[PDB]
Design an enzyme around this catalytic site. Structure first.
Site, PDB file in Angstrom:
ATOM      1  N   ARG B  21       0.791  -1.225   0.000  1.00 59.91           N
ATOM      2  CA  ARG B  21       0.000   0.000   0.000  1.00 59.91           C
ATOM      3  C   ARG B  21       0.834   1.292   0.000  1.00 59.91           C
ATOM      4  NH1 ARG B  21      -0.377   1.171   5.691  1.00 59.91           N
ATOM      5  NH2 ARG B  21      -0.288   3.230   4.788  1.00 59.91           N
ATOM      6  N   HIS B  51      12.882  -0.204  23.671  1.00 59.56           N
ATOM      7  CA  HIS B  51      12.588   0.767  24.703  1.00 59.56           C
ATOM      8  C   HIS B  51      11.156   0.542  25.147  1.00 59.56           C
ATOM      9  CE1 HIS B  51      16.418   2.623  23.446  1.00 59.56           C
ATOM     10  NE2 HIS B  51      16.416   2.617  24.758  1.00 59.56           N
ATOM     11  N   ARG B 127     -15.647 -18.032  24.760  1.00 55.98           N
ATOM     12  CA  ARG B 127     -16.040 -16.778  24.150  1.00 55.98           C
ATOM     13  C   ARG B 127     -15.313 -15.537  24.713  1.00 55.98           C
ATOM     14  NH1 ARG B 127     -21.846 -18.557  22.862  1.00 55.98           N
ATOM     15  NH2 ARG B 127     -21.798 -19.211  25.054  1.00 55.98           N
ATOM     16  N   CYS B 146      -3.989  -3.683  12.875  1.00 53.91           N
ATOM     17  CA  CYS B 146      -3.139  -4.792  12.478  1.00 53.91           C
ATOM     18  C   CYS B 146      -3.268  -5.915  13.509  1.00 53.91           C
ATOM     19  CB  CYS B 146      -1.670  -4.420  12.400  1.00 53.91           C
ATOM     20  SG  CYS B 146      -1.302  -2.907  11.468  1.00 53.91           S
ATOM     21  N   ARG B 166      -3.421  -9.549  11.562  1.00 54.43           N
ATOM     22  CA  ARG B 166      -3.701  -9.706  10.133  1.00 54.43           C
ATOM     23  C   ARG B 166      -2.544  -9.226   9.255  1.00 54.43           C
ATOM     24  NH1 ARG B 166      -3.963  -4.875   7.345  1.00 54.43           N
ATOM     25  NH2 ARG B 166      -4.198  -3.166   8.851  1.00 54.43           N
ATOM     26  N   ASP B 169       4.572  -6.289  10.470  1.00 55.52           N
ATOM     27  CA  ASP B 169       5.840  -5.751  10.044  1.00 55.52           C
ATOM     28  C   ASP B 169       6.775  -6.457  11.016  1.00 55.52           C
ATOM     29  OD1 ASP B 169       8.217  -4.054  10.238  1.00 55.52           O
ATOM     30  OD2 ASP B 169       7.116  -2.393   9.515  1.00 55.52           O
ATOM     31  N   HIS B 207       5.533 -10.074   7.173  1.00 59.37           N
ATOM     32  CA  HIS B 207       6.446  -9.556   6.162  1.00 59.37           C
ATOM     33  C   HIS B 207       7.635  -8.781   6.640  1.00 59.37           C
ATOM     34  CE1 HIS B 207       3.144  -6.408   6.494  1.00 59.37           C
ATOM     35  NE2 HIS B 207       4.193  -5.608   6.434  1.00 59.37           N
ATOM     36  N   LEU B 208       8.643  -8.779   5.788  1.00 57.01           N
ATOM     37  CA  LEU B 208       9.792  -7.923   5.983  1.00 57.01           C
ATOM     38  C   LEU B 208       9.805  -6.857   4.889  1.00 57.01           C
ATOM     39  CD1 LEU B 208      12.326 -10.580   6.951  1.00 57.01           C
ATOM     40  CD2 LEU B 208      11.854  -8.457   8.247  1.00 57.01           C
ATOM     41  N   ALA B 263       7.273   2.474   7.154  1.00 52.51           N
ATOM     42  CA  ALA B 263       6.454   2.731   5.975  1.00 52.51           C
ATOM     43  C   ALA B 263       5.185   3.286   6.627  1.00 52.51           C
ATOM     44  CB  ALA B 263       6.129   1.447   5.250  1.00 52.51           C
TER      45      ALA B 263
HETATM   46  C1  LIG Z   1       3.535  -2.049  16.776  1.00 46.95           C
HETATM   47  C2  LIG Z   1       3.390  -0.899  17.089  1.00 46.95           C
HETATM   48  C3  LIG Z   1       3.166   0.502  17.464  1.00 46.95           C
HETATM   49  N1  LIG Z   1       3.567   1.411  16.394  1.00 46.95           N
HETATM   50  C4  LIG Z   1       2.435   1.797  15.500  1.00 46.95           C
HETATM   51  C5  LIG Z   1       2.471   1.263  14.107  1.00 46.95           C
HETATM   52  C6  LIG Z   1       1.691   1.894  13.113  1.00 46.95           C
HETATM   53  C7  LIG Z   1       1.945   1.703  11.738  1.00 46.95           C
HETATM   54  C8  LIG Z   1       2.983   0.847  11.317  1.00 46.95           C
HETATM   55  N2  LIG Z   1       3.310   0.722  10.006  1.00 46.95           N
HETATM   56  C9  LIG Z   1       4.367  -0.033   9.611  1.00 46.95           C
HETATM   57  N3  LIG Z   1       4.774  -0.004   8.340  1.00 46.95           N
HETATM   58  N4  LIG Z   1       5.039  -0.782  10.510  1.00 46.95           N
HETATM   59  C10 LIG Z   1       4.762  -0.701  11.825  1.00 46.95           C
HETATM   60  O1  LIG Z   1       5.518  -1.453  12.691  1.00 46.95           O
HETATM   61  C11 LIG Z   1       3.747   0.153  12.295  1.00 46.95           C
HETATM   62  C12 LIG Z   1       3.482   0.367  13.666  1.00 46.95           C
HETATM   63  C13 LIG Z   1       4.892   1.734  16.238  1.00 46.95           C
HETATM   64  C14 LIG Z   1       5.281   2.927  15.574  1.00 46.95           C
HETATM   65  C15 LIG Z   1       6.636   3.254  15.383  1.00 46.95           C
HETATM   66  C16 LIG Z   1       7.655   2.400  15.852  1.00 46.95           C
HETATM   67  C17 LIG Z   1       9.054   2.797  15.728  1.00 46.95           C
HETATM   68  O2  LIG Z   1       9.531   3.352  14.723  1.00 46.95           O
HETATM   69  N5  LIG Z   1       9.811   2.599  16.814  1.00 46.95           N
HETATM   70  C18 LIG Z   1      11.283   2.728  16.830  1.00 46.95           C
HETATM   71  C19 LIG Z   1      11.770   3.079  18.255  1.00 46.95           C
HETATM   72  C20 LIG Z   1      11.943   4.568  18.645  1.00 46.95           C
HETATM   73  C21 LIG Z   1      10.756   5.285  19.283  1.00 46.95           C
HETATM   74  O3  LIG Z   1      10.399   4.966  20.426  1.00 46.95           O
HETATM   75  O4  LIG Z   1      10.222   6.198  18.644  1.00 46.95           O
HETATM   76  C22 LIG Z   1      12.032   1.462  16.378  1.00 46.95           C
HETATM   77  O5  LIG Z   1      13.158   1.591  15.885  1.00 46.95           O
HETATM   78  O6  LIG Z   1      11.523   0.352  16.578  1.00 46.95           O
HETATM   79  C23 LIG Z   1       7.291   1.208  16.512  1.00 46.95           C
HETATM   80  C24 LIG Z   1       5.931   0.884  16.704  1.00 46.95           C
HETATM   81  C1  LIG Z   2       0.264  -2.359  12.224  1.00 44.74           C
HETATM   82  C2  LIG Z   2      -0.058  -2.313  13.753  1.00 44.74           C
HETATM   83  C3  LIG Z   2       1.037  -2.759  14.703  1.00 44.74           C
HETATM   84  O1  LIG Z   2       1.046  -2.381  15.876  1.00 44.74           O
HETATM   85  N1  LIG Z   2       1.988  -3.633  14.192  1.00 44.74           N
HETATM   86  C4  LIG Z   2       2.251  -3.848  12.847  1.00 44.74           C
HETATM   87  O2  LIG Z   2       3.121  -4.673  12.557  1.00 44.74           O
HETATM   88  N2  LIG Z   2       1.523  -3.115  11.882  1.00 44.74           N
HETATM   89  C5  LIG Z   2       2.051  -2.945  10.488  1.00 44.74           C
HETATM   90  C6  LIG Z   2       1.657  -3.968   9.445  1.00 44.74           C
HETATM   91  C7  LIG Z   2       2.000  -3.335   8.078  1.00 44.74           C
HETATM   92  O3  LIG Z   2       3.433  -3.297   7.882  1.00 44.74           O
HETATM   93  C8  LIG Z   2       1.485  -1.919   8.360  1.00 44.74           C
HETATM   94  C9  LIG Z   2      -0.025  -1.735   8.156  1.00 44.74           C
HETATM   95  O4  LIG Z   2      -0.355  -1.758   6.727  1.00 44.74           O
HETATM   96  P1  LIG Z   2      -1.751  -2.296   6.138  1.00 44.74           P
HETATM   97  O5  LIG Z   2      -2.929  -1.700   6.793  1.00 44.74           O
HETATM   98  O6  LIG Z   2      -1.657  -3.754   6.356  1.00 44.74           O
HETATM   99  O7  LIG Z   2      -1.898  -2.062   4.690  1.00 44.74           O
HETATM  100  O8  LIG Z   2       1.754  -1.684   9.789  1.00 44.74           O
HETATM  101  O1  LIG Z   3     -17.945 -24.342  13.092  1.00 41.14           O
HETATM  102  C1  LIG Z   3     -18.155 -24.893  14.156  1.00 41.14           C
HETATM  103  C2  LIG Z   3     -19.385 -24.770  14.888  1.00 41.14           C
HETATM  104  C3  LIG Z   3     -19.462 -25.272  16.179  1.00 41.14           C
HETATM  105  N1  LIG Z   3     -18.453 -25.898  16.740  1.00 41.14           N
HETATM  106  C4  LIG Z   3     -18.669 -26.220  18.169  1.00 41.14           C
HETATM  107  C5  LIG Z   3     -17.592 -25.664  19.081  1.00 41.14           C
HETATM  108  C6  LIG Z   3     -18.169 -25.855  20.482  1.00 41.14           C
HETATM  109  O2  LIG Z   3     -18.191 -27.271  20.784  1.00 41.14           O
HETATM  110  C7  LIG Z   3     -19.607 -25.314  20.207  1.00 41.14           C
HETATM  111  C8  LIG Z   3     -19.723 -23.756  20.296  1.00 41.14           C
HETATM  112  O3  LIG Z   3     -20.076 -23.391  21.672  1.00 41.14           O
HETATM  113  P1  LIG Z   3     -19.415 -22.289  22.616  1.00 41.14           P
HETATM  114  O4  LIG Z   3     -17.963 -22.419  22.474  1.00 41.14           O
HETATM  115  O5  LIG Z   3     -19.902 -20.922  22.362  1.00 41.14           O
HETATM  116  O6  LIG Z   3     -19.719 -22.561  24.029  1.00 41.14           O
HETATM  117  O7  LIG Z   3     -19.907 -25.720  18.823  1.00 41.14           O
HETATM  118  C9  LIG Z   3     -17.227 -26.083  16.092  1.00 41.14           C
HETATM  119  O8  LIG Z   3     -16.307 -26.769  16.497  1.00 41.14           O
HETATM  120  N2  LIG Z   3     -17.147 -25.581  14.814  1.00 41.14           N
END
Ligand SMILES: C#CCN(Cc1ccc2[nH]c(N)nc(=O)c2c1)c1ccc(C(=O)N[C@@H](CCC(=O)O)C(=O)O)cc1
Ligand SMILES: *c1cc(=O)[nH]c(=O)n1[C@H]1C[C@H](O)[C@@H](COP(=O)(O)O)O1
Ligand SMILES: O=c1ccn([C@H]2C[C@H](O)[C@@H](COP(=O)(O)O)O2)c(=O)[nH]1
Ligand SMILES: C#CCN(Cc1ccc2[nH]c(N)nc(=O)c2c1)c1ccc(C(=O)N[C@@H](CCC(=O)O)C(=O)O)cc1
EC number: 2.1.1.45
Lengths: 264, 264
Positions: B21, B51, B127, B146, B166, B169, B207-208, B263
């Protein structure tokens, strides 16, 4: 399948006895991932016969955005009858969330059309998700979503899917889900003129119920057979136009069915 | 940490080149899972210096229900500035969804208090889930979640958590994310008089970034040192009552820092 019977054994060997909601008892582990390469064959369990009618009508039911078992009934599918209210409904379960998630301000979001437009228009997106876990409507639901959440991915022309399942009953419900989502990846891939890749299953509480203990033993002694191949016999002009007749499963030679009581 | 360094090696050995993206280009795998037993030590990476000030502060901000950077600013944490608007706002991201998910019938659900009630009164529930993925509000969010969903589990008086990320990074975001959720498990467990179990991390698109390849190989050439120890010096009356000063990390001797671009 080897991965599936390896998860059965894992549960049997490491799970903790927990009292569950039913009062039946479970043996459980927390955290497990399985990968199924779909190029290698369709992941329908072959150590017990699995019946596709329910698997297919349930997925098409979902893509319709319908949460009332009348269609299922009309197609002879019984799986949801226990949970349906006095006149057929389950409340805002899977299909309503998939097709019409309600925003706080009254609009509806169609997560399956979004995902279609994302696969054609933006396939490198890291956000191709469909979520059924609508925290704001869980209370109106007959049953909280088990296969809560999923994510698609495209790389080198292949479509992969990861499913997060918060609760899993290994013997009865896990074969059903694996096949169901492997089938949606093939429908989704066909529409988007794409290759199929991996289906990744990830689980939360993964368990085997106390009264499925003999059946598991019986299933663990059988040798897995070659995986079938799914044939999709015609391309609709949308994912919403597939029909039961469109699917065929060649190569499936399963061990005989094993019946086991449902804990509700 | 052994697990983290194996994941980086895996992304390097099995990743596909994919464009993102932000158009910087990544190397990705889809689907990974790794487990960290919290009894072994507090999972803060040691092959480069992290840190902790920002890991604690962001987590208290989340628990406050806050989505405006001013708090973070007076504790001079600048990790979220690149995404905030003119007024410091991020829109309804993590803190708001966690503490007040908006329903379509006017309500708001505090997902952290609900999780705490469940751990006290129903710990075997399958749950106990917090979701930041709110589909009806993603368009007001400064960035989509994320770390989107997490589940708690209680076995033998030990609390475990599983996070589904989902998009991940691996050089920058992931050491932040592992340390944040390990903290929350210790805080939850302290409040509920539970011992710490496992934190289990599952990723979607893992990913890297291309401009991180050298820093990653540098890191990989280092041996992990023994993990630090978390000492909490107080039991606050609620989980919303912790202060920066209640936490101490003992015996943390990391390899030197390695700096790398975000990024945005
Ligand atoms: C996960 C998460 C939270 N977040 C939020 C968050 C939001 C968008 C993102 N987008 C991308 N591309 N990667 C991410 O890891 C990411 C993280 C973070 C944001 C910045 C840093 C960062 O650059 N930290 C420095 C340390 C220095 C500092 O404290 O500023 C580093 O070198 O790691 C780490 C986590
Ligand atoms: C988002 C949130 C977090 O704290 N840690 C993460 O690793 N990320 C990263 C994932 C990806 O590099 C980027 C989000 O991009 P997109 O929404 O997946 O397109 O931040
Ligand atoms: O896709 C499905 C649907 C149901 N169950 C089972 C999981 C549990 O045995 C029960 C769901 O009940 P609770 O976890 O909410 O209690 O149904 C699965 O394994 N997979
Ligand atoms: C999972 C799911 C949908 N369902 C039920 C069902 C029940 C609880 C749920 N709970 C939650 N949280 N979500 C659900 O989607 C859900 C679905 C099923 C019900 C029964 C069988 C079953 O007993 N199978 C028998 C044979 C009958 C058949 O082939 O249909 C077997 O021997 O396997 C399978 C699936």
């Amino acid at each position: 399948m080897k991965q599936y019977l390896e998860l059965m054994q894992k549960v049997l060997d490491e799970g903790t006895q927990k009292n569950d909601r039913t009062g039946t008892g479970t043996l459980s582990i927390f955290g497990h991932q399985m990968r199924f390469n779909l190029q290698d064959g369709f992941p329908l369990v072959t150590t017990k016969r699995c019946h596709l009618r329910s698997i297919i009508h349930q997925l098409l039911w979902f893509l319709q955005g319908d949460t009332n078992i009348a269609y299922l009934h009309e197609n002879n599918v019984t799986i949801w009858d226990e949970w349906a209210d006095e006149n057929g409904d389950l409340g805002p379960v899977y299909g309503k969330q998939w097709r019409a998630w309600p925003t706080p301000d009254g609009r509806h979001i169609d997560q399956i059309t979004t995902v279609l437009n994302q696969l054609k228009n933006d396939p490198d997106s890291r956000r191709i998700i469909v979520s059924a876990w609508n925290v704001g409507e869980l209370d109106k639901m007959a049953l909280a979503p088990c296969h809560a959440f999923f994510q698609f991915y495209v790389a080198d022309g292949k479509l992969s899917c990861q499913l997060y399942q918060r609760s899993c009953d290994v013997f009865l419900g896990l074969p059903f889900n694996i096949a169901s989502y492997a089938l949606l990846v093939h429908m989704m891939a066909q529409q988007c003129d794409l290759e199929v890749g991996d289906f990744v299953w990830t689980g939360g509480d993964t368990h085997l119920y106390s009264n499925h203990m003999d059946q598991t033993h019986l299933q663990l002694s059988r040798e897995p057979r070659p995986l079938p191949k799914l044939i999709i016999k015609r391309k609709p002009e949308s994912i919403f136009d597939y029909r039961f007749e469109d699917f065929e499963i060649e190569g499936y030679d399963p061990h005989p069915g094993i019946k086991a009581p449902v804990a509700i």
